[PDB]
Design a protein around this ligand. Structure first.
Ligand SMILES: O=C(c1ccc(O)c(C(=O)n2cc3ccc(F)cc3c2)c1)n1cc2cccc(F)c2c1
Ligand SMILES: O=C(c1ccc(O)c(C(=O)n2cc3ccc(F)cc3c2)c1)n1cc2cccc(F)c2c1
Length: 440
């Protein structure tokens, strides 16, 4: 076992009393009078991770050797406490007094569960002194210089009467595994290394190998096949997004017809995000991580950005490997047709419709075309897109209506899927060209 938490600190003098500022008091009042208490742990772990990253980047910028960089949790049932300590960059006295800002999120989270909070911090800057910070959540906090403070930050939470469950090792273990499994620094609970995983969505896409995606896909999809498609989407405008999307190699089953995990800086928000993607993209598996995450205007914005990017991805795949894309459309194309029918906005219907592939009177049997490719072949004076739904190519070609049209070179899409009729009825037009069935 490997533990660093113990009572090493002492205070030689008296404490200085300070009064919280008005809005901090008002938010402390809200917390006292107001739930999902367990999330204080994931917030504290996240701040510890940020403090460690700050130290690491600073030391690597210099030529300095790296110390042990770890996050530790300790429970004490006999004393009703939970403690977190990390060996990161710590806080100066100025910061401990210069108190939403991530110092604040860990703050209100802690007082959700605490009768009082006891903090020791020492900045990694050379010559830094250690400090004790104390508060019971009233309008006052106390600060005093402390000896025996390890570089970094230790937070001791003296738990409320109704929050003693967080002094149980097993309860805390389960909370850590639920929300904090992908934390990027070593994490220990009561001296035992927690088994945590690698957040590969945060890596630059060019550095993630196929075997890593295969392992991660099988984990997030709880699957045994490989992904037929992988999209690692990283952007910083207009939104922060680090995401990986997978399409299964297997065809969709009934389970897929009846999704994705949501994170924020490697902190789980929802294991199964409800509306992160449009419903028609529910066959996608994977992860979405956004620093911008508190239904909301933001979730709507994120969903629309991801929809556009995934449609672009599939368009680009049809260009990279048309035979592979044709199989994907055969296997997953009912989701696209569903999305066209259920979509409200004409622009969204036409975006999804860019993924449709059909046979054509102008192409060899078996060969597929897109609507935009059909449009590029339209002859001057003919301004509509013509189609015919039939069980197979032979029956379409021997339609008396198609036979007559053949005399004037008009291309006709041949559509064999039973839901093509409804899809094209609902699509109605594409790139300002009406869709017309050549038989009524
Ligand atoms: O959540 C934290 C917290 C937890 C772990 C930490 O390592 C730190 C820290 O020193 N940095 C240093 C950082 C430097 C950069 C950065 F990005 C994050 C950092 C976290 C802060 N709280 C909550 C508090 C509530 C009251 C008093 C406190 F002391 C509190 C500390
Ligand atoms: O009057 C007609 C009607 C009559 C003759 C037709 O050839 C068509 C047709 O399919 N065309 C006519 C064409 C003319 C030119 C062409 F290129 C293709 C054509 C296909 C429709 N209908 C058809 C109905 C179906 C359901 C309900 C109704 F009330 C309907 C009334």
């Amino acid at each position: 076992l490997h533990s660093i938490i113990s009572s090493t600190e002492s205070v030689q003098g008296s404490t200085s009393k300070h009064e919280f500022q008005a809005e901090t008091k008002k938010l402390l009042d809200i917390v006292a009078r107001s739930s999902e208490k367990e999330v204080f742990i994931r917030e504290l772990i996240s701040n510890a991770s940020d403090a460690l990253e700050k130290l690491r980047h600073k030391l690597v910028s210099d030529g300095q050797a790296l110390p042990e960089m770890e996050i530790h949790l300790q429970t004490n049932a006999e004393k009703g406490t939970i403690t977190i300590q990390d060996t990161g960059i710590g806080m100066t006295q100025e910061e401990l007094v210069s108190n939403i800002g991530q110092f604040g999120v860990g703050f209100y989270s802690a007082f959700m569960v605490a009768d009082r909070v006891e903090v020791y911090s020492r900045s990694a800057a050379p010559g830094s002194l250690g400090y004790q910070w104390l508060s019971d959540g009233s309008g006052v906090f106390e600060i005093a210089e402390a000896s025996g403070v390890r570089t970094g930050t230790k937070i001791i939470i003296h738990l409320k009467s109704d929050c003693k469950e967080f002094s149980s090792e097993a309860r805390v273990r389960d909370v850590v595994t639920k929300y904090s499994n992908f934390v990027s620094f070593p994490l220990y609970l009561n001296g035992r290394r927690m088994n945590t995983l690698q957040a590969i969505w945060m890596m630059d896409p060019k550095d993630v190998r196929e075997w890593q995606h295969e392992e991660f896909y099988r984990y997030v999809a709880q699957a045994h096949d490989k992904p037929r498609y992988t999209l690692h989407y990283k952007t910083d405008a207009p939104l922060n997004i680090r995401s990986i999307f997978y399409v299964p190699d297997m065809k969709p089953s009934m389970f897929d017809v009846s999704s994705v995990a949501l994170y924020s800086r490697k902190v789980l928000i929802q294991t199964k995000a409800t509306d992160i993607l449009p419903k028609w993209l529910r066959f996608i598996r994977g992860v979405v991580d956004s620093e911008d995450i508190p239904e909301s205007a933001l979730i709507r914005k994120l969903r629309d950005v991801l929809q556009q990017r995934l449609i672009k991805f599939f368009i680009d795949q049809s260009k990279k490997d048309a035979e592979k894309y044709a199989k994907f459309f055969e296997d997953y194309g009912l989701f696209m047709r569903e999305g066209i029918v259920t979509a409200t906005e004409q622009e969204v219907k036409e975006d999804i419709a860019k993924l449709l592939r059909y046979e054509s009177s102008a192409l060899p049997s078996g060969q597929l075309t897109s609507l935009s490719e059909y449009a590029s072949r339209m002859r001057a004076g003919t301004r509509n897109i013509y189609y015919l739904c039939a069980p197979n190519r032979h029956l379409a070609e021997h339609s008396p209506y198609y036979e007559a049209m053949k005399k004037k070179d008009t291309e006709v899409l041949f559509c064999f899927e039973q839901f093509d009729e409804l899809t094209l009825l609902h699509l109605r037009e594409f790139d300002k060209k009406k869709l017309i069935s050549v038989e009524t």
